[PDB]
Amino acid sequence: PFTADKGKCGLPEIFDPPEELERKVWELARLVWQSSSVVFHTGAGISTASGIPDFRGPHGVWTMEERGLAPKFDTTFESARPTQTHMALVQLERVGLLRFLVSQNVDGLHVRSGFPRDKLAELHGNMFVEECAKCKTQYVRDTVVGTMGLKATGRLCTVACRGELRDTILDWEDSLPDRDLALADEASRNADLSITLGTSLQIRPSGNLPLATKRRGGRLVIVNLQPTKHDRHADLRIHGYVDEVMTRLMKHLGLEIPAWDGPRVLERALPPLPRPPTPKLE
Ligand SMILES: Nc1ncnc2c1ncn2[C@@H]1O[C@H](COP(=O)(O)OP(=O)(O)OC[C@H]2O[C@H](O)[C@H](O)[C@@H]2O)[C@@H](O)[C@H]1O
Ligand SMILES: [Zn+2]
Secondary structure (H helix, E strand, C coil), X not given: CCCCCCCCCCCCCCCCCHHHHHXXXXXXXXXXXXXXXXXXXXXXXXXXXXXXXXXXXXXXHHHHHHCCCCCCCXXXXXCCCCCHHHHHHHHHHHCCCCXXXXXXXXXXXXHHHCXXXXXXXXXXXXXXXXXXXXXXXEEECCCCCCCCCCCEEEEECCCCCCCEEEECCCCCCCCCCHHHHHHHHHHHHHCCEEEEECCCCCCCCHHHHHHHHHCCCCEEEXXXXXXXXXXXXXXXXXXXXXXXXXXXXXXXXXCCCCCCCCCCCCCCCCCCCCCCCCCCCC
């Protein structure tokens, strides 16, 4: 835990020049249009623009620790608002363009943004989510569940149970949740396009899931300011702010980025909304 391998921290940022950025985002549009099954992989870099530092960016939690420095939060978990990237993922799921979302983030922002839980895998757990040790019933709170490392919170299951409620925050030794991992892996294996957003892909097996898309000839796209573990394997690497990449992509897709109505929890994906017609490519 003290000894835990925190991988490579504080690598240089890469900034694609704007004409190269414009080009690459058009190409991402073309891949989205060509794909039958698109899966998104998120990590801590999609929340930095909400005030939440990452792990391994220049001001990452682990990076700043390596140097004797403290990470800075510009918000609480509760006051954090989903980013333009978070809201674009909501929209792309609603128009049938996103088959599944896989997140290593515990920041709770995908759920609070209103993203259907039956189309999300929270690999590392969710700070607002406790789970009944007895009946496995999960509870999505309006505040952070106060424990980490799957400890009893002090609340009991109210299901028609009295089970001890625990946090969902994985510790270093903790195996990932079988349910989330299995659906993530299946979605990743069966996808024809895997897009990674603000993750350095250094965690096994979370950071490996995008490579599964590569077998049977799926395409892998990586959006990240820093190098990532699998950059070699990517058909397209875009070095820019995800908010800028996602905003430009949505405009190419003819989609608006919807308003956030404050923290909401959708259990189950709604019926798919209309989407603009597809460009002729060739
Ligand atoms: N606005 C931004 N736009 C684009 N890229 C960004 C931005 N902000 C940060 N990045 C990049 O985003 C990347 C964030 O990578 P890491 O910080 O390692 O987060 P993980 O999600 O991959 O961490 C995996 C797990 O490991 C931990 O122990 C926890 O358990 C995590 O769950 C960096 O490369 C930044 O360059
Ligand atoms: Zn229970």
